[PDB]
């Protein structure tokens, strides 16, 4: 029963040279790492080295053209970096961005391998830039390569093609890239909870709605839990897990659980507008630990309040280490629109999951 931790200060080198105050700050990962030390969680984890993802590994999910374009930014002049950035939705690029994206991907590969070989039971990856918005052919929403999707394929590549991977995406944004990459795949189950507001919340696509259940063989293996009607918090996320995430996950019976763990639904996030507490995230973590014989990898995605993300991810690691979950306040009355959301997801997926009937 060992917990791995991967963190490399080199991933701070990715920066926005046109707005040094952009919220995807290098200090996101250094502040999370610092808090793990202060709380004395770091000395209880087995440290896992970062490594560069290879170009071949990037090809598990991404087109050669997308790879070589991002690769080329490494030697671009500032004017070319600025032009290239404007060809994507919400992307800034510096000369170090490509290397940082490879470091984030490879760090998760080493973690998945450590888990799947039994060197550790579970693991946390404190990495940036994030991944879940990145598509097969394009970068998007602060993300260059889809770190979680690549780690799922990497895990299958060192075990077997049909390794059942669950990706739980609790970042406040829909992970459009992860959904699309696995949309017709029945070996990777994708479950996303996200602020939706009938398509008005980033990334502003109806792909995020509850009726997108997957395609062909992948029907039923894409689960969108969209929130409408303003602020959500622990009661709604607890109920989504109890009524949807955990019943479906148990029926799927993953052999590995990847968490796309953005912490931008946390209280205090300047962008998410939600109220999930660190104790809330501890409890979501604890529940997922009941799956896949405990084989859980937590991968940092978004999250923009330096204190909120540092307290929230620390609590998750605390859970992975075996600590007992902190008490929760008043989970009872959900917002009406959240009950409606959960009922829409239940109606969408009951055809595919007997546990929902
Ligand atoms: C009407 N909006 C405003 C907005 C401005 C910039 N933010 C960028 C962004 C991306 C990812 C994450 C994250 O944390 N993902 O997990 C957080 C912020 C998004 C929304 C935008 C961009 C493009 C088109 C339309 C619009
Ligand atoms: K999400
Ligand atoms: K899928
Ligand atoms: Zn996000």
From TrEMBL:
Q: Which domain of life is it from?
A: Eukaryota
Question: Where does this protein reside within or beyond the cell?
Answer: Cell projection, Axon; Cell projection, Dendrite; Cytoplasm, Cytoskeleton, Cilium basal body; Cytoplasm, Cytoskeleton, Microtubule organizing center, Centrosome
Residues given in the record as Zn(2+) binding sites: 171, 173, 264
Q: Which family does it belong to?
A: Belongs to the histone deacetylase family. HD type 2 subfamily.
Name the record gives this protein: Protein deacetylase HDAC6
Kindly list the organism's lineage. Answer: Eukaryota, Metazoa, Chordata, Craniata, Vertebrata
* Annotated gene: hdac6
């Amino acid at each position: 029963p060992i917990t791995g931790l991967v963190y490399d200060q080199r991933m701070m080198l990715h920066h926005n040279m046109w707005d040094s105050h952009h919220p995807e700050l290098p200090q996101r990962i250094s502040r999370i790492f610092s808090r793990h030390e202060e709380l004395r969680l770091l000395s209880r984890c087995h440290r896992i080295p970062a490594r560069l993802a290879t170009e071949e590994e990037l090809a598990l999910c991404h087109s050669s053209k997308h790879i070589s374009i991002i690769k080329s930014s490494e030697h671009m002049k500032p004017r070319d970096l600025n032009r290239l950035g404007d060809e994507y939705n919400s992307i800034f690029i510096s000369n170090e961005s490509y290397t940082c994206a490879l470091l984030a991907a490879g760090s998760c590969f080493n973690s998945a391998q450590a888990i799947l070989t039994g060197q550790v039971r579970n693991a946390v990856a404190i990495v940036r830039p994030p991944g879940h918005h990145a598509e097969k052919d394009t970068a998007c929403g602060f993300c260059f390569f889809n770190t979680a999707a690549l780690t799922a394929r990497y895990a299958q590549s060192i075990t077997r093609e049909s390794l059942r991977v669950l990706i739980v995406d609790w970042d406040v944004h829909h992970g459009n890239g992860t959904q699309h990459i696995f949309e017709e795949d029945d070996s990777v189950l994708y479950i996303s909870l996200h602020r939706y507001e009938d398509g008005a919340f980033f990334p502003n696509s109806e792909d995020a709605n509850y009726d997108k259940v997957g395609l062909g063989k992948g029907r039923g293996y894409n689960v969108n839990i969209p929130w409408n009607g303003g602020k959500m918090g622990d009661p709604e996320y607890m109920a989504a897990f109890h009524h949807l995430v955990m019943p479906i996950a148990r029926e799927f019976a993953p052999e590995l659980v990847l968490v796309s763990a953005g912490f931008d639904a946390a209280r205090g996030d300047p962008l998410g507008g939600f109220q999930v507490t660190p104790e809330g995230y501890a409890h979501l973590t604890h529940q997922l630990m009941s799956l896949a014989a405990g084989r859980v990898l937590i991968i940092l995605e978004g999250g923009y309040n330096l204190t909120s993300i540092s307290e929230s991810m620390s609590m998750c690691t605390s859970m992975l280490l075996g600590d007992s979950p902190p008490s929760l306040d008043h989970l009872t009355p959900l917002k009406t629109s959240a009950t409606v959301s959960i009922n829409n997801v239940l109606r969408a997926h009951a055809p595919f999951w007997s546990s929902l009937r």
